[PDB]
């Protein structure tokens, strides 16, 4: 999740500290997952062949 | 633009003192929030 998050410490108590989304740093990209397609299709063919039986 | 999934929000709260209070801004996914009924609130 390529984002440098800033923790805004909000006093709403006394004591109680609320955290607000600090100004997200610059360029904007959403979370992801790089899945090795080689490892993905590997276990795919293994189980699928256990099913025509 | 190039829309945006999230929102640059702002709203009202309290602070260390009782009388005096506090507005502060945060950023929420449009999944975390929803509209209500002038701009969209």
């Amino acid at each position: 999740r390529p984002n440098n998050n800033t923790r805004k410490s909000i006093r709403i108590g006394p004591g109680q500290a609320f955290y607000a989304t600090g100004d997200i740093i610059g360029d904007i990209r959403q979370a992801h997952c790089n899945v090795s397609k080689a490892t993905w299709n590997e276990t795919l063919g293994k189980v699928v062949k256990q099913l025509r039986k | 633009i190039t829309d945006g999934e999230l929102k640059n929000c702002s709203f009202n709260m309290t602070t260390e003192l009782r009388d005096k209070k506090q507005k502060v801004y945060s950023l929420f996914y449009r999944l975390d929030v929803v509209q209500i009924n002038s701009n969209k609130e």
Epitope: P2, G26, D27, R29, Q30, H32 | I1, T2, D3
Partner: antibody, heavy 129, light 101 residues
Framework: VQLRESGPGLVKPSETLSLSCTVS?????????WTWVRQSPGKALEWIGD???????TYNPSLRSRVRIELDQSIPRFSLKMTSMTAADTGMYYC???????????????????????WGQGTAVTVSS | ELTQPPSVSVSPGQTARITCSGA??????TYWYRQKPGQAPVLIIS???QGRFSASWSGTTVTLTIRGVQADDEADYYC???????????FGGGTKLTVLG
């Protein structure tokens, strides 16, 4: 980035026309979109189409069913094709480089447009006999 | 049809503004070019990330602001971005900048 268009510049009415643009002298080119922009004599520069090396070409609406953009990426010399020609398409034709700048990974598209920062010398194109 | 002025005027020293109006300017960033009559349209406005030349976005319009009009800058200026469907591009008119004096 030399944009050496090797072309004729003259063609007959109702037949077809082909252009080229030898892309030479470079070290980060196919990042960006290769386009063709035309200007009728003293008129508006008007977009024709562009090509992203992978084959994802795009075309100007009222032209899309006649204009084609090829890719001899081995040379590399990319080409352009127009058909059913009249004198109305006469003017200056500028090959240009629609730039793309990325911070991350292509699959999620972490890039914007920089603009057409490399316009070629151009070829004066004429339709007559 | 992108709504530009085909020409604007300014005197030796003042600043100027060219407004390219339309519909898709509430969605796509705006890029600009400088074609001195017969030259290669020079790129000047970009989105390098999400000095004397700039352009201010404003709703249906994006206003090209030019500061420091030396007579060296007399040219046709063209606004160009993209429609809302991210398929095709096209250009506006071609603003001849006049330099008085």
């Amino acid at each position: 980035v030399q944009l050496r268009e090797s072309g004729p510049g003259l063609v007959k009415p109702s037949e077809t026309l082909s252009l080229s643009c030898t892309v030479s002298q470079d070290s980060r080119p196919s990042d960006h979109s290769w386009t063709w922009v035309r200007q009728s004599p003293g008129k508006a520069l008007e977009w024709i189409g562009d090509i992203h090396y992978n084959g994802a070409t795009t075309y100007n609406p009222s032209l899309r069913s006649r204009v084609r953009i090829e890719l001899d990426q081995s040379i590399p010399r990319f080409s352009l094709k127009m058909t059913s020609m009249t004198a109305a398409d006469t003017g200056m034709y500028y090959c240009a480089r629609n730039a793309i700048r990325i911070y991350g990974v292509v699959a999620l598209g972490e890039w914007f447009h920089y603009g057409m920062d490399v316009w070629g010398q151009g070829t004066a194109v004429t339709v007559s006999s | 049809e992108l709504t530009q002025p085909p020409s604007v005027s300014v005197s030796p020293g003042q600043t100027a503004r060219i407004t390219c109006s339309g519909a898709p300017l509430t969605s796509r960033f705006t890029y600009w070019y400088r074609q001195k009559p017969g030259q290669a349209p020079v790129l000047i406005i970009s989105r390098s990330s999400q000095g004397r030349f700039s352009a201010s976005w404003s709703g249906t319009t994006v206003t090209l602001t030019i500061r420091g009009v030396q007579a060296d800058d007399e040219a046709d200026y063209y606004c160009q971005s993209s429609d809302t469907s991210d398929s095709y591009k096209m250009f506006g008119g071609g603003t001849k900048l006049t330099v008085l004096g």
